[PDB]
Amino acid sequence: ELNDQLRVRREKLKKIEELGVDPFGKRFERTHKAEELFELYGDLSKEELEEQQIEVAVAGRIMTKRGMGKAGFAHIQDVTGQIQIYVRQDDVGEQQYELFKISDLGDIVGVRGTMFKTKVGELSIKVSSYEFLTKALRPLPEKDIEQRYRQRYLDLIMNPESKKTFITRSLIIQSMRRYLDSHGYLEVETPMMHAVAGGAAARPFITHHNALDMTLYMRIAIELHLKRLIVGGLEKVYEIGRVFRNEGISTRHNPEFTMLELYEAYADFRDIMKLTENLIAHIATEVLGTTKIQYGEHLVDLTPEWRRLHMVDAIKEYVGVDFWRQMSDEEARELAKEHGVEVAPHMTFGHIVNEFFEQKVEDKLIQPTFIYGHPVEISPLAKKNPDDPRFTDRFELFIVGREHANAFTELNDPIDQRQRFEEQLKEREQGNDEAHEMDEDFLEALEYGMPPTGGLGIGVDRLVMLLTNSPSIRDVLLFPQMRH
Amino acid sequence: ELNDQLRVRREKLKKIEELGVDPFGKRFERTHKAEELFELYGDLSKEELEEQQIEVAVAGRIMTKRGMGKAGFAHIQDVTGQIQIYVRQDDVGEQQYELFKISDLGDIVGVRGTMFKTKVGELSIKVSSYEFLTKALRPLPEKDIEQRYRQRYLDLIMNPESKKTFITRSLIIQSMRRYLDSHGYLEVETPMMHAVAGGAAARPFITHHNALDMTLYMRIAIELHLKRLIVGGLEKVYEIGRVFRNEGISTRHNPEFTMLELYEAYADFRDIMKLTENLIAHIATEVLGTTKIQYGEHLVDLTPEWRRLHMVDAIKEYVGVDFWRQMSDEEARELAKEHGVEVAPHMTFGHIVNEFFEQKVEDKLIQPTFIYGHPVEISPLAKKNPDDPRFTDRFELFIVGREHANAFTELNDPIDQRQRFEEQLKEREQGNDEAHEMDEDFLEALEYGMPPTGGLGIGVDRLVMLLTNSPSIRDVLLFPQMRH
Numbered sequence: 001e002l003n004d005q006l007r008v009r010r011e012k013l014k015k016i017e018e019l020g021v022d023p024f025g026k027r028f029e030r031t032h033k034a035e036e037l038f039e040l041y042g043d044l045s046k047e048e049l050e051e052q053q054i055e056v057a058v059a060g061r062i063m064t065k066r067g068m069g070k071a072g073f074a075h076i077q078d079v080t081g082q083i084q085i086y087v088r089q090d091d092v093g094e095q096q097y098e099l100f101k102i103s104d105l106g107d108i109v110g111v112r113g114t115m116f117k118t119k120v121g122e123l124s125i126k127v128s129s130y131e132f133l134t135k136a137l138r139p140l141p142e143k144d145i146e147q148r149y150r151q152r153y154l155d156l157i158m159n160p161e162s163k164k165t166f167i168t169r170s171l172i173i174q175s176m177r178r179y180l181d182s183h184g185y186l187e188v189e190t191p192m193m194h195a196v197a198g199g200a201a202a203r204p205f206i207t208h209h210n211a212l213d214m215t216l217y218m219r220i221a222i223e224l225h226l227k228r229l230i231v232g233g234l235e236k237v238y239e240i241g242r243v244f245r246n247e248g249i250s251t252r253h254n255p256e257f258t259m260l261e262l263y264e265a266y267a268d269f270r271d272i273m274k275l276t277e278n279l280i281a282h283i284a285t286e287v288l289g290t291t292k293i294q295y296g297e298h299l300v301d302l303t304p305e306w307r308r309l310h311m312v313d314a315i316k317e318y319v320g321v322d323f324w325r326q327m328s329d330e331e332a333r334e335l336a337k338e339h340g341v342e343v344a345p346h347m348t349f350g351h352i353v354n355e356f357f358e359q360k361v362e363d364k365l366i367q368p369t370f371i372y373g374h375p376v377e378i379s380p381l382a383k384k385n386p387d388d389p390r391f392t393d394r395f396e397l398f399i400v401g402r403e404h405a406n407a408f409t410e411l412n413d414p415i416d417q418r419q420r421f422e423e424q425l426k427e428r429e430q431g432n433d434e435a436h437e438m439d440e441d442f443l444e445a446l447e448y449g450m451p452p453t454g455g456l457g458i459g460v461d462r463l464v465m466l467l468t469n470s471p472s473i474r475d476v477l478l479f480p481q482m483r484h
Numbered sequence: 485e486l487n488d489q490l491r492v493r494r495e496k497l498k499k500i501e502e503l504g505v506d507p508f509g510k511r512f513e514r515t516h517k518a519e520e521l522f523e524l525y526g527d528l529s530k531e532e533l534e535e536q537q538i539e540v541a542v543a544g545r546i547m548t549k550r551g552m553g554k555a556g557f558a559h560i561q562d563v564t565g566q567i568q569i570y571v572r573q574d575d576v577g578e579q580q581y582e583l584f585k586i587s588d589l590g591d592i593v594g595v596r597g598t599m600f601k602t603k604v605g606e607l608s609i610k611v612s613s614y615e616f617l618t619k620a621l622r623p624l625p626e627k628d629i630e631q632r633y634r635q636r637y638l639d640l641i642m643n644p645e646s647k648k649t650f651i652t653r654s655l656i657i658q659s660m661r662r663y664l665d666s667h668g669y670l671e672v673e674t675p676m677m678h679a680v681a682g683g684a685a686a687r688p689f690i691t692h693h694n695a696l697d698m699t700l701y702m703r704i705a706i707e708l709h710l711k712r713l714i715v716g717g718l719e720k721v722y723e724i725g726r727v728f729r730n731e732g733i734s735t736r737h738n739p740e741f742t743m744l745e746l747y748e749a750y751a752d753f754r755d756i757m758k759l760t761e762n763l764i765a766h767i768a769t770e771v772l773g774t775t776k777i778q779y780g781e782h783l784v785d786l787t788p789e790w791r792r793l794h795m796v797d798a799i800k801e802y803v804g805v806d807f808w809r810q811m812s813d814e815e816a817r818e819l820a821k822e823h824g825v826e827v828a829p830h831m832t833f834g835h836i837v838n839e840f841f842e843q844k845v846e847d848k849l850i851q852p853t854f855i856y857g858h859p860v861e862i863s864p865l866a867k868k869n870p871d872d873p874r875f876t877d878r879f880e881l882f883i884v885g886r887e888h889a890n891a892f893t894e895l896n897d898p899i900d901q902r903q904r905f906e907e908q909l910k911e912r913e914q915g916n917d918e919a920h921e922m923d924e925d926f927l928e929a930l931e932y933g934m935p936p937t938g939g940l941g942i943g944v945d946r947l948v949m950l951l952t953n954s955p956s957i958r959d960v961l962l963f964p965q966m967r968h
């Protein structure tokens with residue numbers, strides 16, 4: 001019992017046809033958004049308004065209604081807010097009034113009429129024509145997170161704070177393309193279906209092309225095709241697009257997410273550090289009007305210049321172990337054991353250094369920080385640091401304790417690039433099933449010559465989380481991937 | 485005929501290393517692109533250039549090189565074109581001159597020098613500093629059609645007009661979002677991985693998520709989730725994104741392509757017609773400077789307003805057959821036999837009408853034409869025309885004989901929408917594997933009430949082909965799907 005009123009709504013549908021109305025509407029032209037009427041006419045008195053007879057036409061979903069007698073009111077909601085309509089049978093006539101009376105919460109209508117103020121003072125529209133636009137067969141639920149994510153639409157109608165996050169997300173990506181376009185980076189589109197899933201260390205989604213009878217992998221990264229565009233002489237390219245990773249959900253991961261990948265010939269990772277803080281600072285200024293923002297319990301300062309800290313120096317500062325020292329893989333393992341860092345059988349010194357960083361340091365980096373110099377074994381596409389080849393000129397950007405970007409001075413030496421892949425294939429033998437695969441095609445492109453280049457990848461959803469103060473990626477995705 | 489070249493290029497690599505240089509270079513700062521040089525200094529006399537000593541720095545790939553002992557020339561190519569450089573041991577010293585002498589066609593280098601003109605009058609750079617940037621292990625090609633899609637980068641380097649097509653492509657997309665954004669449409673991002681592949685008639689790519697253990701379908705359309713947004717009250721939304729259909733390629737089909745879908749609450753298909761022609765004409769204007777373009781042997785006038793033609797009327801016009809009269813399925817079958825129109829076993833009058841249009845008519849549609857009134861049977865998500873429900877208030881945009889867009893007054897009645905789905909399941913039981921699938925989720929969404937709405941889908945690559953006079957979609961994708 002209770003939802004039996006579903007029969008009541010179903011009933012109200014045929015009655016509307018009997019009134020001779022299309023219960024699902026026709027086009028309806030409007031003159032204004034609810035918020036505009038307030039902004040334009042909110043300060044005119046009841047008298048100045050009857051005086052000016054402003055005609056307007058608006059449409060929206062009925063959120064509240066109080067009829068009775070031969071006149072009633074209702075609050076109608078458009079994407080900008082609600083506006084009260086006053087409907088009297090003496091104005092709209094018998095027929096349209098019956099339509100108003102039979103109208104229910106959830107139903108969508110359009111009206112033409114004049115701006116007016118009741119004796120209570122609430123700006124309203126004194127209706128001259130009432131148009132039924134669409135019958136809601138179910139009532140809007142009673143004002144869980146299951147529903148907000150599984151039925152985003154109800155969340156968007158009932159929770160203004162949620163709809164603004166999505167509008168800001170739009171502004172953020174728009175702001176991003178604007179900066180990137182004005183700085184000469186060419187926007188491009190590369191394949192999301194790959195012969196070989198490469199460009200990152202991740203598990204791919206596998207699919208099949210019936211006609212070509214070929215196995216394809218949804219891309220886990222945009223990197224290798226953008227490098228082919230740098231060999232192509234395109235110099236500055238970027239792509240803000242979807243990438244897919246066959247991994248579980250979390251407050252920071254969605255299997256399909258949005259990544260910005262960007263390449264710039266003749267720059268190195270220090271140049272990309274400057275670009276990354278400037279871009280982001282550009283975006284926060286443009287959308288929030290300030291680079292000082294609040295995220296959860298933190299006051300995060302996005303004002304460039306951001307802190308630069310070598311991964312090894314970070315481990316020294318936050319744990320006290322000094323990996324600058326040349327040591328054997330076993331000594332690294334002993335250290336791991338002593339400090340509670342979990343390590344896998346395919347791991348050697350380099351991987352272990354990164355585990356110390358991930359497991360004991362990461363969550364402590366609240367202010368924007370470029371952690372750089374990642375060990376060569378976890379950076380198969382980055383160029384080795386000329387002074388200490390155990391590390392590469394790579395950096396990751398951390399803020400509020402989490403990874404927001406990855407970037408590097410690109411490895412453009414095909415011989416060295418082929419060896420990194422051989423090293424990865426070996427690791428896969430020892431069980432690292434996220435190790436990159438061989439991609440002969442990519443190697444042959446490199447062999448035609450790729451100029452020294454600086455590359456960058458930003459998790460766009462995570463940046464949006466940060467700039468809208470969303471605790472979870474599920475809050476910045478219209479339709480997050482649900483379990484079950 | 486041999487890899488002696490590969491070998492000699494490897495030999496030089498060791499040689500430039502033994503000269504103390506990083507054969508894969510470091511960052512390199514530039515002041516100009518070859519293009520701006522010509523634009524700024526192409527008109528200056530040879531002697532005022534000598535007097536002025538205008539210092540510049542540029543970088544690019546060596547396309548031509550001519551020896552002659554202790555002074556040499558080369559043309560280096562950047563993304564804007566090529567500039568001749570003049571290098572003499574006289575000026576740059578022996579170690580840089582040696583670097584220049586080893587440099588091959590294909591290698592990438594940077595130079596600092598002053599502007600000057602040769603006796604011949606050619607604007608050039610008198611090199612003061614020669615930086616070796618990257619060794620190409622593989623020779624640039626000499627001076628087929630499949631080859632260049634297979635190695636787009638070779639094509640981008642050797643063929644000027646080539647990158648142009650892609651630069652135009654990005655300008656076309658950018659111009660589309662600017663128009664859409666300024667007209668109130670909210671750019672959004674909805675799922676590409678679906679529980680049920682819907683929004684179109686097409687076979688999907690199927691994949692699986694390991695952790696969640698679930699079958700996922702790559703989207704074949706953007707429609708169902710944008711419609712959820714319209715139920716959600718957002719009013720105007722659009723998304724320019726990749727879509728996936730598991731079908732063979734053709735000069736107008738790629739398995740992954742870019743579609744623009746947009747929805748507008750309170751509008752109908754006639755409003756979407758006007759939006760479509762104003763949006764496309766605007767893009768041609770903004771990007772090409774004209775609405776008159778060349779495509780193959782045709783001069784297409786994209787200036788509004790375009791021709792509106794009812795599908796049935798088009799059939800009477802080009803075929804001489806009438807379908808306005810009430811007619812039986814068997815009579816439609818007879819007409820088809822008489823006219824050589826192929827029909828399947830599940831087809832009835834409505835499908836047959838569309839088969840007459842597609843097989844005998846659409847290829848004659850050269851100038852922009854809104855063909856409208858598609859039969860209800862082939863339009864499961866469009867609202868029936870009220871005066872004659874055998875047809876729907878839908879249109880497809882044809883230009884140069886090919887479908888560029890699809891649109892309709894949306895079916896927002898959930899009862900009818902469920903019926904259409906059921907009819908689709910029967911057609912499937914009857915051999916139509918393109919039939920739509922039942923999506924209870926989408927239906928639930930409509931039960932909350934979707935306002936009357938006008939929707940639109942535009943094949944973005946097809947639009948790009950049109951405005952760049954590209955005969956195949958493969959000419960506008962940087963990396964088109966290759967056959968094994």
Ligand SMILES: NCCCC[C@H](N)C(=O)NS(=O)(=O)OC[C@H]1O[C@@H](n2cnc3c(N)ncnc32)[C@H](O)[C@@H]1O
Binds near residue numbers: 245255
């Ligand atoms: N050539 C220089 C590096 C370029 C980027 C490299 N190809 C890349 O993919 N690196 S990444 O760190 O693996 O991915 C980039 C970012 O995407 C974000 N990301 C990664 N996986 C997810 C998931 N699963 N959800 C949301 N966001 C994600 C996160 O901020 C990462 O910093």
Ligand SMILES: NCCCC[C@H](N)C(=O)NS(=O)(=O)OC[C@H]1O[C@@H](n2cnc3c(N)ncnc32)[C@H](O)[C@@H]1O
Binds near residue numbers: 745887890891
């Ligand atoms: N709700 C109103 C209709 C919205 C669009 C609907 N969801 C849609 O998918 N229609 S479509 O006609 O099937 O696709 C839209 C356009 O995409 C283009 N398209 C379709 N398939 C391909 C392929 N495979 N390659 C390139 N372009 C394609 C073509 O121009 C179509 O007109």
Ligand SMILES: [Mg+2]
Binds near residue numbers: 396403405406
């Ligand atoms: Mg990373």
Ligand SMILES: [Mg+2]
Binds near residue numbers: 880887889890
């Ligand atoms: Mg179509």
